Design a protein around this ligand. Structure first.
Ligand SMILES: CCCCCCCC/C=C\CCCCCCCC(=O)OC[C@H](O)CO
Ligand SMILES: CCCCCCCC/C=C\CCCCCCCC(=O)OC[C@H](O)CO
Ligand SMILES: CCCCCCCC/C=C\CCCCCCCC(=O)OC[C@H](O)CO
Ligand SMILES: CCCCCCCC/C=C\CCCCCCCC(=O)OC[C@H](O)CO
Ligand SMILES: CCCCCCCC/C=C\CCCCCCCC(=O)OC[C@H](O)CO
Ligand SMILES: CCCCCCCC/C=C\CCCCCCCC(=O)OC[C@H](O)CO
Ligand SMILES: CCCCCCCC/C=C\CCCCCCCC(=O)OC[C@H](O)CO
Ligand SMILES: CCCCCCCC/C=C\CCCCCCCC(=O)OC[C@H](O)CO
Ligand SMILES: CCCCCCCC/C=C\CCCCCCCC(=O)OC[C@H](O)CO
Ligand SMILES: CCCCCCCC/C=C\CCCCCCCC(=O)OC[C@H](O)CO
Ligand SMILES: O=C(O)CN(CCN(CC(=O)O)CC(=O)O)CC(=O)O
Ligand SMILES: O=C(O)CN(CCN(CC(=O)O)CC(=O)O)CC(=O)O
Lengths: 247, 247
């Protein structure tokens, strides 16, 4: 029984809504098939938990978004008049660190993780924390928290780059290196889009609507989560296939 | 310019307010002196970054709480009528993982971290995510998210226990083991209090007021952050002092 004009602002156009709904179905369907494929491998082979955990969270998230995107607590309706997509940011904290853990052991071989991994993980959690806080903020305080996100974010990209470069030199000279390069390209483009979409969305300058932001986020979600995971899985398969033959 | 009855509910009694304000000063003062002490060691000795990073965040957080506890985005005022202490939960995501990273290398000696560390870190981030979401939630959905927090939380405590036990056997037989036991006692009591305070506070059954919850949280913050860090530092010092003499 609380009233605010901002909570009733348009969520976007019907086309954007329909586009958004359509991409949820695709995301879900693609996630189920990936989950089936990974589960199929777990029984008949070895499969990293990172690919599976991330994909299960992604499947659940699109289902939850489809039904509850605009209901609390998946969207927060603040006394500032603004609406914060908490489901978006919550999901990042669950999935992004696991992706970075996957990135710290690209070959799947080692049991150990370096000091780089810790610095990488800490900087990414902070990035999300600052970004979420910025979305909740109002006025110039919003710009300050976004800047902290960029600082933490730059640290994450820096460490990530190093992991990719060390990974490139660590993997064997043929297809494996081509795959690592593909993973790096896919990673930096998709991860780079997130801050861009933030600026363009309601939390930023409101160029995009809620539905419009959702459309864009679902595409880069598929890129960063499902596709990158599938590539990383394929890389791990190649490493296994190579070591048997070449030792 | 939005109206809601819940946003204007009492924050607590004047005694609770005053108690809360007093503990902020103590927390800040204690954090500054610890920061000075750690900084003093960095120039004149070796000092782990975990103790320092955590303490710097804690000093900043109490300063921010003192001035801005009830201002957005440090408190979220939701269309549900409820007020969510986002500053509390944001701070946990920044500091708790670093504490667990410290816990994964108690002796300060190794450069590597095991698969336990990753599982420990992932489960703790999730715990906070579910807990924060529960605080934002309303009705029975709140109970479901809290349960997910307990599941993730139990996993964290399980792995933490193992780290403590392996750490106990790894450290030398005298004072070092006594210190690890002290750290474990301090850790489980302080960490266990968080879910208890959550239930007792406004986000739970509202036995405690906002100020009352703040009082309790500041005490366990000092226990879990500053004191546990100081003990962990002391342990690392003992390991160093022992290895020179005993190899
Ligand atoms: C995949 C790439 C782009 C998705 C296409 C984005 C779809 C853009 C939706 C906007 C639109 O087409 O507007 C019509 C609207 O229904 C009139 O009110
Ligand atoms: C998995 C990702 C979970 C994110 C937390 C956000 C949870 C969003 C839950 C929405 C449920 C609502 O239900 C009330 C009507
Ligand atoms: C080749 C020049 C491209 C022009 C700019 C395109 C837009 C920015 C994309 C950056 C991702 C860079 C990925 C780096 C690949 C690592 C190589 C191993
Ligand atoms: C650089 C990114 C900083 C992020 C901050 C973007 C906020 C822009 C903004 O709020 O301006 C629009 C106007 O206030 C109507 O909503
Ligand atoms: C390089 C790969 C990046 C793709 C970014 C995703 C594309 C973003 C699509 C935005 C479409 C929107 O338009 C709807 C409009 O706001 C009406 O409500
Ligand atoms: C340190 C341990 C406990 C702190 C003491 C907690 C302080 C409790 C405050 C409640 C109180 O004393 O109430 C008086 C109030 O001002 C009348 O309106
Ligand atoms: C370090 C812990 C940061 C937590 C994020 C919460 C940030 C809370 C910032 C409050 C600032 C307000 O200022 C507007 C008047
Ligand atoms: C000794 C019996 C105590 C009675 C119950 C007290 C309340 C619960 C406290 C649990 C922390 C347990 C810490 C375990 C110490 C690890 C030993 C190494
Ligand atoms: C077990 C913890 C579950 C946490 C959920 C606690 C919520 C209790 C509650 O809301 O009841 C009070 C009443 O609704 C007036 O505010
Ligand atoms: C074992 C160590 C645990 C200490 C828990 C901290 C103690 C919690 C103190 C709660 C005091 C409150 O009382 C204020 C009341 O709500 C009026 O507004
Ligand atoms: O099947 C349909 O008609 C579409 N869905 C989704 C419609 N959504 C709007 C949206 O998110 O696009 C309803 C809602 O989220 O409240 C129905 C439903 O959620 O029961
Ligand atoms: O010095 C004082 O009088 C106390 N502080 C704190 C008073 N607080 C209330 C509280 O949090 O206890 C003011 C506020 O947070 O708005 C003054 C100030 O913030 O400028």
């Amino acid at each position: 029984q609380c009233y605010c004009a901002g909570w009733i602002e348009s969520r976007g156009t019907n086309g954007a809504q329909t586009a958004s709904n359509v991409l949820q179905w695709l995301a879900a369907g693609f996630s189920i098939l990936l989950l089936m494929f990974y589960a199929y491998q777990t029984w008949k082979s070895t499969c990293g938990w990172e690919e599976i955990y991330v994909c299960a969270i992604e499947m659940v998230k699109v289902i939850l978004e489809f039904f509850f995107e605009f209901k609390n607590p998946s969207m927060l309706y603040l006394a500032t008049g603004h609406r914060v997509q908490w489901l978006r940011y919550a999901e990042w904290l669950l999935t992004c660190p696991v992706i970075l853990i996957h990135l710290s052991n690209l070959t799947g071989l080692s049991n150990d993780y370096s000091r780089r991994t810790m610095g990488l993980l800490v900087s990414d959690i902070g990035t999300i924390v600052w970004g979420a806080t910025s979305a909740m903020a109002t006025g110039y305080v919003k710009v300050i928290f976004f800047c902290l996100g960029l600082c933490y974010g730059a640290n994450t990209f820096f460490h990530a780059a190093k992991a990719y470069i060390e990974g490139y030199h660590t993997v064997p000279k043929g297809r494996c290196r081509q795959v690592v390069t593909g993973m790096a390209w896919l990673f930096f483009v998709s991860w780079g889009m997130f801050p861009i979409l933030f600026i363009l969305g309601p939390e930023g300058f409101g160029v995009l609507s809620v539905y419009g932001s959702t459309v864009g986020h679902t595409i880069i979600d598929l890129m960063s989560k499902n596709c990158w995971g599938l590539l990383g899985h394929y890389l791990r398969v190649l490493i296994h296939e190579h070591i048997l033959i070449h030792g």
